[PDB]
Design a protein around this ligand. Structure first.
Ligand code: A1EDO
Length: 117
């Protein structure tokens, strides 16, 4: 199942799945930039979340060819969702928004991954 991908071929296949998340309004709004614990008054954020991730950083990594293989991109999207579910209470708006994005991503990513082999 080893395959070498060109970064531009990955960017072209995967960026639409990331665009699908950015289009979710308001559910993508918390996810568009890195969590700033100072600005948001959540000083315990980096006690809990040791590997932060957000849409801006994933987009930057696609734009600079830092994903060799499609599973590395999927791992960062899942990291972003797993961090939000870990930090936020199950009852919170951000947790619910995370769950919405995860549903959208599952629908978008499945056929793209099948198409990349
Ligand atoms: C419309 O949706 C929102 C509006 C405001 C807020 N916020 C507040 O109620 C207070 C601060 C602000 C806010 N919180 C968070 C927050 C917090 C905990 C988090 O864990 N993981 C993540 C990701 C995460 C994000 C982010 N924000 C900024 C807020 C979403 N703004 C982003 C810029 O456009 C306007 C709305 C959250 C949401 Cl969901």
């Amino acid at each position: 199942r080893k395959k070498i991908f060109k970064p531009e071929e990955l960017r072209q296949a995967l960026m639409p799945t990331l665009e699908a998340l950015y289009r979710q309004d308001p559910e993508s709004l918390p996810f568009r930039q890195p969590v700033d614990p100072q600005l948001l008054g959540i000083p315990d954020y980096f006690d809990i979340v040791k590997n932060p991730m957000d849409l801006s950083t994933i987009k930057r990594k696609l734009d600079t060819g830092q994903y060799q293989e499609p599973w590395q991109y999927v791992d960062d999207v899942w990291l972003m969702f797993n961090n939000a579910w870990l930090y936020n209470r199950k009852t919170s708006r951000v947790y619910k928004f995370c769950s919405k994005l995860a549903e959208v991503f599952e629908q978008e990513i499945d056929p793209v991954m099948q198409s990349l082999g």
